[PDB]
Amino acid sequence: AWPKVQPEVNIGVVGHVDHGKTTLVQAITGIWTSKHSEELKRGMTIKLGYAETNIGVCESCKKPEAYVTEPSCKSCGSDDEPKFLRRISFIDAPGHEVLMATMLSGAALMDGAILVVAANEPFPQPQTREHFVALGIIGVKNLIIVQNKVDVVSKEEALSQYRQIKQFTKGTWAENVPIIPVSALHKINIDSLIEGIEEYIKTPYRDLSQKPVMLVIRSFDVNKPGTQFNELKGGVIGGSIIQGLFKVDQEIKVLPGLRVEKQGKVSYEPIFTKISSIRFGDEEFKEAKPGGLVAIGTYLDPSLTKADNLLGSIITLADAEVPVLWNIRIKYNLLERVVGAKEMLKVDPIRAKETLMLSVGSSTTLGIVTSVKKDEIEVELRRPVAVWSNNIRTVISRQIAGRWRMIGWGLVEI
Amino acid sequence: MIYSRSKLPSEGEILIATVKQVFDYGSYVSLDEYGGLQAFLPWSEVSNIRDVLKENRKVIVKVIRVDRRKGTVDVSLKKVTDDERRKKNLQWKKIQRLDKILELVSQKLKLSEKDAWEQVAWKLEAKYGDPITAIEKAVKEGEKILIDAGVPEIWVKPLLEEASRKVKMSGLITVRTNEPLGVEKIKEVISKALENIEQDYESLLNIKIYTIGAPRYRVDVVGTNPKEASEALNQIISNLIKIGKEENVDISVV
RNA sequence: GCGGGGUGGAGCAGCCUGGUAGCUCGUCGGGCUCAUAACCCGAAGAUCGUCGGUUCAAAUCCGGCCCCCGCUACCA
Ligand SMILES: Nc1nc2c(ncn2[C@@H]2O[C@H](COP(=O)(O)OP(=O)(O)NP(=O)(O)O)[C@@H](O)[C@H]2O)c(=O)[nH]1
Numbered sequence: 001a002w003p004k005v006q007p008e009v010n011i012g013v014v015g016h017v018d019h020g021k022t023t024l025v026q027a028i029t030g031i032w033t034s035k036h037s038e039e040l041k042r043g044m045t046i047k048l049g050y051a052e053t054n055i056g057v058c059e060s061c062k063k064p065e066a067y068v069t070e071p072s073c074k075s076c077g078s079d080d081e082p083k084f085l086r087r088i089s090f091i092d093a094p095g096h097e098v099l100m101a102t103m104l105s106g107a108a109l110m111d112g113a114i115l116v117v118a119a120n121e122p123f124p125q126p127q128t129r130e131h132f133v134a135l136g137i138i139g140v141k142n143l144i145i146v147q148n149k150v151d152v153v154s155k156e157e158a159l160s161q162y163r164q165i166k167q168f169t170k171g172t173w174a175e176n177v178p179i180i181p182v183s184a185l186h187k188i189n190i191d192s193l194i195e196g197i198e199e200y201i202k203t204p205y206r207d208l209s210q211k212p213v214m215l216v217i218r219s220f221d222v223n224k225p226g227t228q229f230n231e232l233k234g235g236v237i238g239g240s241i242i243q244g245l246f247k248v249d250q251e252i253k254v255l256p257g258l259r260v261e262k263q264g265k266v267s268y269e270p271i272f273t274k275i276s277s278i279r280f281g282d283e284e285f286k287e288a289k290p291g292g293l294v295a296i297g298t299y300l301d302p303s304l305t306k307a308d309n310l311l312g313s314i315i316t317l318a319d320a321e322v323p324v325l326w327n328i329r330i331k332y333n334l335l336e337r338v339v340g341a342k343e344m345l346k347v348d349p350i351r352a353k354e355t356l357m358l359s360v361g362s363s364t365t366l367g368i369v370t371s372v373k374k375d376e377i378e379v380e381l382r383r384p385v386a387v388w389s390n391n392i393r394t395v396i397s398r399q400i401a402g403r404w405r406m407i408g409w410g411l412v413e414i
Numbered sequence: 415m416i417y418s419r420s421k422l423p424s425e426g427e428i429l430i431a432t433v434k435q436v437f438d439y440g441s442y443v444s445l446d447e448y449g450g451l452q453a454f455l456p457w458s459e460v461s462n463i464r465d466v467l468k469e470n471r472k473v474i475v476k477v478i479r480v481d482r483r484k485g486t487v488d489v490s491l492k493k494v495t496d497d498e499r500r501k502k503n504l505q506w507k508k509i510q511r512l513d514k515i516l517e518l519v520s521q522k523l524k525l526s527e528k529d530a531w532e533q534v535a536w537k538l539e540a541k542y543g544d545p546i547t548a549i550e551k552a553v554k555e556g557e558k559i560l561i562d563a564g565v566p567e568i569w570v571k572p573l574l575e576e577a578s579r580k581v582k583m584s585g586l587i588t589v590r591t592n593e594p595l596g597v598e599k600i601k602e603v604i605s606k607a608l609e610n611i612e613q614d615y616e617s618l619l620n621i622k623i624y625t626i627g628a629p630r631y632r633v634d635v636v637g638t639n640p641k642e643a644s645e646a647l648n649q650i651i652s653n654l655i656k657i658g659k660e661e662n663v664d665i666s667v668v
Numbered sequence: 669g670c671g672g673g674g675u676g677g678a679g680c681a682g683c684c685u686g687g688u689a690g691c692u693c694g695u696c697g698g699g700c701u702c703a704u705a706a707c708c709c710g711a712a713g714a715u716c717g718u719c720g721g722u723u724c725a726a727a728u729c730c731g732g733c734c735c736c737c738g739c740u741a742c743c744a
C-alpha cells in the first residue's frame with residue numbers, strides 16, 4: 001500500500017467563464033472547488049478553491065490510460081500496483097473580471113499551470129489576455145494550454161482553434177506551450193493531461209535554506225455552531241509554503257494580522273503564537289514542506305481569522321524581521337494594452353493622487369500616489385504590506401468602468 | 415386552591431369569592447379563603463350585572479353574618495368599598511401567584527394542597543408580607559431566608575425551584591482575546607469562572623458555555639430553578655468577566 | 669434544535685377560558701345631493717392545509733401526515 005506524501009507541487013488552473021475549470025480539477029481529482037454557498041448558487045467561480053490527488057504509473061502498460069491517480073491499474077488491464085510519483089493539487093481561479101485580482105494571489109503560489117481556452121466561445125475572449133499576462137507578470141512561463149468541452153464542437157473547428165492557439169503560443173515567452181485536447185466532464189484524454197503536467201511541468205529545485213515563510217490565503221474558525229468550551233481548537237490559516245518549512249510547536253508571528261488603535265493613530269499588531277496543527281487535505285503530517293497549500297492551526301483565536309479576514313497576510317518565524325512600510329516605492333513598467341478588455345484602449349499614464357490596486361503575493365491593497373516619477377513611484381497605502389524579499393512581484397490595476405484592470409508590473413525596492 | 419388556618423371568615427372582613435350558582439332568592443358564591451367556603455349572597459345585599467353575576471366569575475365580597483354552631487356564613491358583594499377592595503384584590507393577586515407556585519411545586523413533588531399550605535402560608539406568615547415576598551427575599555440574599563422562617567427544607571429548595579423538572583434559560587456573551595495562547599486562555603477564563611457557583615448558589619442541574627458567532631458566544635443556566643435563572647445567569651457571565659478582566663481577555667454579555 | 673404559517677379578493681384578528689369562522693380596505697345594490705367625492709344601510713363572498721384522537725359537542729386541545737416555509741453556514 002501507497003505512502004502518504006504531502007503535495008510537493010501546485011498547479012494553477014486558470015481560464016475564462018464556463019471553460020471547464022472546476023470540472024477540469026474534478027477530472028484530475030474527482031472533487032470540485034465551489035465551497036461557499038454563493039459559488040454554487042451562482043454557478044460561477046468567485047473565490048479560489050482546493051483539491052488533491054496522487055499519481056501512479058503502471059510500468060508494464062502502454063501510455064497513457066494506465067496513468068491513473070489511485071492505487072490501481074485496472075484501466076489498463078494490469079494487476080500491478082503502479083509506481084508512485086507524488087501527490088498533486090491545484091489553484092482553481094475565477095473567470096470573472098471583478099474577481100480577477102483573487103487568482104493573482106494564487107499566481108504567486110503555483111509551481112505550474114494548466115490554462116484553458118474555449119472552443120465554444122469567440123476567441124480570444126478578452127479576459128484570456130489578463131490570465132496570460134498574470135502568468136507573465138508573476139513569471140510562471142511553464143504552461144499547458146488545453147481546448148475544452150470538445151464534445152459539442154467538431155474536430156475541424158477544434159483544429160481551427162488549435163491553429164489559433166498554436167499561434168497564440170508563438171512570439172512570446174510561450175513559444176512551445178503545448179495543446180492536449182481534453183473535456184473536463186466526460187473524463188476524456190485526462191490521462192494524457194496528467195502525462196503533460198508531469199513531463200512539461202516539473203516541481204522546481206527547492207530551497208530549504210531561506211527563512212520559512214507561510215503565505216496566507218484562507219482561514220477558518222473550525223469551532224462549529226454549538227461548540228462547547230471543552231474541545232476548542234485554534235483558528236486555521238491555510239496557504240502554501242514556497243521557501244522553508246514548518247514544524248510542530250514552531251514559534252511564529254502573523255504579519256500584519258490584527259488592527260489595533262495605537263498612539264492617537266491607526267496601526268497594526270504583530271500576532272504571536274505557537275503552531276498546533278499542520279494539515280494537508282485529509283492526511284496528518286507533523287512537518288510542512290513546500291508544494292501545495294498547507295493549513296496550519298495554532299494557539300490563536302479564530303475570531304481574528306474566520307471568514308478570510310487576514311486575506312493574503314504573511315507569517316514568519318518569531319525570531320525574524322520583515323520590512324513593514326505604510327508607504328512603498330515601486331518600479332512599474334506599464335502594460336501595452338488593457339488585457340482583459342473587450343475594447344483594448346491605450347493605457348492612460350498614472351497621474352498624481354490617483355487610486356490604484358496592488359496584489360502582493362496574496363495580500364491586496366488600495367493606494368494613492370504621493371510622488372510621481374516616470375519609472376519610480378512612492379505610494380501611500382491604507383495598510384502596510386509585508387515585503388519579505390527584494391522587488392517582490394506585486395500586480396497592479398487601475399479601475400475601468402468599475403472593473404480594476406491591470407496597468408503594469410511593479411517592484412518594491414527595500 | 416388555598417388552604418388557610420381557620421374555619422369561618424372574620425366578622426366584617428372583606429375578601430374575594432368565586433360565584434358558583436344563582437337561584438331565584440339568592441346566590442351560591444365560593445370564597446377562595448377557607449378551602450372554598452359556600453356563602454349565600456342574598457339579593458337583599460346586592461346592588462352589566464350579567465358580567466358580575468356570571469357563571470364562574472371571581473368577585474369581591476364582604477362577610478357580615480357568621481354562625482359557629484352549624485358552621486355557616488352570609489356574605490355581601492355590595493358592602494365592599496373602594497378603599498378596601500383595592501388592597502384586598504392586591505393581596506388576592508399575591509395569594510394567586512402563591513397558588514401558582516405552591517400548586518406547581520406540589521404537582522411536581524407529588525404532594526397535596528392541605529399540608530402544603532400548612533407548611534408555606536402559615537409557617538411563613540410569621541414573616542411579614544404576603545408569602546410571595548417570603549420567597550421574593552429568599553431569592554435575593556440567600557436561600558437561608560426560607561430556613562429562617564422555620565419551614566423544613568422540603569418546600570425550601572423545591573418550591574424555590576419551580577416558580578418562574580428542568581427549565582431552559584441562557585444568554586449570549588461576546589469575547590475577544592489577543593494573547594499568544596488565546597485559546598488556552600479563553601478556556602482559562604472559562605475554567606476559572608465556572609468554579610464554586612454550586613456552593614454560593616446551591617444545588618442546580620446543568621450549565622454549558624458555547625458559541626453562536628465567531629466572537630459571539632452562548633452560556634447556559636438550565637436547572638430546576640428558573641426563579642434562580644438570572645442569579646445563576648448574570649453573575650456567572652460576570653465570573654467570566656471578573657476573570658477575563660484579569661487575564662487579558664475581554665469578556666461581557668451581549 | 670427541528671419548529672412555525674397553514675382560514676372570503678384580500679390583511680390579520682379569533683386559542684389557553686370549546687356551541688356565531690370576527691373587525692377593516694375591497695365587491696355589487698340602495699340611500700343622501702342639482703350631480704360627483706366623503707358619510708349611512710343591506711346582501712355575496714373562506715366554511716379554518718388535511719387524516720385522526722379528545723370532546724355530547726372544536727380555527728378554539730393536540731398528535732400523524734401534504735404544502736409553504738423558517739430563525740442558520742466548507743466544519744483545517
Ligand atoms: N459537457 C461539459 N459540460 C461541462 C464541462 N465543464 C463544465 N461543464 C458544465 O458547463 C457549465 C459551465 O462550466 P463550468 O463548470 O462553470 O466551467 P468553469 O470554467 O469552471 N466556470 P467558472 O470558473 O466561471 O465557475 C456547468 O453547468 C458545468 O457543469 C465539460 O468539460 N463538458
Ligand SMILES: [Mg+2]
Nearest residue numbers: 021022044045
Ligand atoms: Mg470555475
Ligand SMILES: [Mg+2]
Nearest residue numbers: 701704705706
Ligand atoms: Mg356619491
